[PDB]
Design a protein around this ligand. Sequence first.
Ligand SMILES: [Zn+2]
Ligand SMILES: [Zn+2]
Ligand SMILES: [Zn+2]
Lengths: 97, 58
Amino acid sequence: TGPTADPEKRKLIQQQLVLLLHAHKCQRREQANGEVRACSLPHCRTMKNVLNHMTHCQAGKACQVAHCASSRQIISHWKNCTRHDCPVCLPLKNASD
Amino acid sequence: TDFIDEEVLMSLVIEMGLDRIKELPELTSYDCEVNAPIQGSRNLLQGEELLRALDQVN
Ligand SMILES: [Zn+2]
Ligand SMILES: [Zn+2]
Ligand SMILES: [Zn+2]
């Protein structure tokens, strides 16, 4: 199949995924609200801009802007992953109150 | 009830230490391909697909 999966890498992936989910909702909140909120979470601004760059980025994997290629791969896994036993998604998809 | 709830997300944010002032690890494409694989390279989301994917929580 390939190399072995690293549990440390998995944790960083789901951390970036959670940050991307926040930034998106952090923006959709302002997209409906209207006013520009000053979010205090570290890197939220960064991932907001990553998202905005990625929606019109054409370089794909080769891209240079940090977190663009990794975010595209991560969000793509998020959408296509249906498994109930996935080590990356399970804490997120099955979060709840 | 397909969209993720904000209150839970904030709990995740804090429970993962993402509110702490730290540096953001720069993950390589290759590492994500291994630990977060997709059926094939034709399934790399682009454009509006990206935003739509972050709305759902299958
Ligand atoms: Zn934010
Ligand atoms: Zn890019
Ligand atoms: Zn998964």
